[PDB]
Design a protein around this ligand. Structure first.
Ligand SMILES: O=c1cc[nH]c(=O)[nH]1
Ligand code: SF4
Length: 206
């Protein structure tokens, strides 16, 4: 079901990414510019999964290149993690969006659980390909994709999780989505940034 028949029998990331360009596993390929596959290499020990490409990513062809990605880079650097050593992807690989009159960007819309489950074959192929030691799940959509639709990121901060139906049984660490840290009162943003750095250090210490 979903994307499964579009996923080739290969662990080569370049070939998986090409095949995802042709996926019709849900409706999101229609209005998006292109599939945005994960970035990084199969030697990566840490895999990080966001929700979906946003406006900038949909046109760059790469994940986490916009304001959320810049905040994530600042957190990674503070956690002493090299972004180039990670494998970074998203639960959903085509941008789901709308525009508002007078808006300065295309606005992301939340993928339905249906779309997440349809796209998950790709995440499974990425995980099988990369064999990460730990998966960082950035925000609610990504965390629920592997931990269940009832899972609450806010209730499990700092925790190393392991679930039985995840390929290779990597450690899993669920944390706040970097987009959440972009706005809000300064003290709240600074406390939340420190907690993201903490969670990234937990994952890197696995
Ligand atoms: O790649 C991206 C960029 C922004 N937000 C995400 O969840 N992923
Ligand atoms: S979002 Fe995922 S399942 Fe849906 S068409 Fe795109 S790659 Fe396929």
């Amino acid at each position: 079901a979903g994307a499964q028949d579009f996923v080739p029998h290969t662990a080569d990331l370049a070939e998986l990414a090409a095949a995802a360009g042709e996926c019709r596993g849900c409706g999101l390929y229609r209005d998006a510019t292109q599939a945005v596959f994960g970035a990084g290499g199969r030697s990566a020990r840490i895999m990080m999964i966001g929700e979906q490409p946003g406006d900038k990513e949909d046109l760059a062809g790469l994940p986490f290149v916009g304001p959320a990605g810049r905040l994530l880079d600042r957190a990674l650097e503070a956690a002493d993690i090299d972004r180039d050593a990670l494998y970074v992807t998203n639960a959903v690989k085509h941008f789901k969006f709308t525009r508002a009159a007078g808006g300065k960007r295309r606005i992301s819309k939340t993928p339905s659980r249906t779309e997440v489950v349809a796209c998950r074959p790709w995440l499974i192929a990425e995980m099988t390909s990369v064999e990460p030691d730990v998966v960082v799940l950035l925000g609610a959509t990504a965390a629920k994709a592997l931990l269940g639709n009832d899972f609450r990121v806010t209730q499990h901060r700092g925790e190393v999780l392991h679930v039985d139906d995840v390929p290779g049984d990597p450690a899993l660490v669920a944390t706040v989505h970097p987009s959440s840290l972009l706005a809000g009162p300064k003290e709240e943003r600074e406390s939340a940034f420190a907690g993201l750095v903490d969670d990234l250090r937990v994952a890197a210490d696995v």
